[PDB]
């Protein structure tokens, strides 16, 4: 679990969004596993605006942060589950690093700020949904 709070917005994994998130929906993209809902309070997370391929992510299944090298956002494969059937996930970045179910929502950060959130992973790999292209989160 986990979310990003920037201004009057809450960014969560679309498969983990609550009834409240859907009742205050701003934007969602099933292919990206993202959903953004509105909030009454002001968020202070800084979104990174860069092309970094190194950063640190929080791994709840180990209560630890890990440094990782990650790929550029791209279209990659995901099987099925209570949430989606096989499809290409867009805007996804992979890194070699520990993850298993429950780890979705952990933040990936670089020196410039928030890069993305854990969304998938498998056999020793972890997948992050990028948020750096969503320029409207700041305005
Ligand atoms: C860190 S998730 C993980 C890691 C290792 C193993 C298994 C998982 C769970 C997982 O991969 N999924 C269930 C939730 C939806 C995911 C796709 C989202 O577009 C797929
Ligand atoms: Zn950066």
From Swiss-Prot:
<feature type="binding site">
    <location>
        <position position="50"/>
    </location>
    <ligand>
        <name>Zn(2+) 1</name>
    </ligand>
</feature>
<comment type="subunit">
    <text>Homodimer.</text>
</comment>
<feature type="active site" description="For protease 2A activity">
    <location>
        <position position="15"/>
    </location>
</feature>
<protein>
    <recommendedName>
        <fullName>Protease 2A</fullName>
    </recommendedName>
</protein>
<feature type="active site" description="For protease 2A activity">
    <location>
        <position position="33"/>
    </location>
</feature>
<feature type="binding site">
    <location>
        <position position="52"/>
    </location>
    <ligand>
        <name>Zn(2+) 1</name>
    </ligand>
</feature>
<feature type="binding site">
    <location>
        <position position="112"/>
    </location>
    <ligand>
        <name>Zn(2+) 1</name>
    </ligand>
</feature>
<comment type="function">
    <text>Cysteine protease that cleaves viral polyprotein and specific host proteins. It is responsible for the autocatalytic cleavage between the P1 and P2 regions, which is the first cleavage occurring in the polyprotein. Also cleaves the host translation initiation factor EIF4G1, in order to shut down the capped cellular mRNA translation. Inhibits the host nucleus-cytoplasm protein and RNA trafficking by cleaving host members of the nuclear pores. Counteracts stress granule formation probably by antagonizing its assembly or promoting its dissassembly.</text>
</comment>
<feature type="binding site">
    <location>
        <position position="110"/>
    </location>
    <ligand>
        <name>Zn(2+) 1</name>
    </ligand>
</feature>
<feature type="active site" description="For protease 2A activity">
    <location>
        <position position="104"/>
    </location>
</feature>
């Amino acid at each position: 679990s986990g979310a990003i709070y920037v201004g009057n917005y809450r960014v969560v994994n679309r498969h983990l969004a609550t009834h409240n998130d859907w009742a205050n929906l701003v934007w969602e993209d099933s292919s990206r596993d993202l959903l953004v809902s509105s909030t009454t309070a002001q968020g202070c997370d800084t979104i990174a605006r860069c092309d970094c391929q190194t950063g640190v992510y929080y791994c709840s299944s180990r209560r630890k942060h890990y440094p990782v090298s990650f790929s550029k956002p791209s279209l990659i494969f995901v099987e099925a589950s209570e949430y989606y059937p096989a499809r290409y996930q867009s805007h996804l970045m992979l890194a070699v690093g520990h993850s298993e179910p429950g780890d979705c929502g952990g933040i990936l950060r670089c020196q410039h700020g928030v890069v993305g959130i854990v969304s998938t992973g498998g056999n020793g790999l972890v997948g992050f949904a990028d948020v750096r292209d969503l320029l409207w989160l700041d305005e």
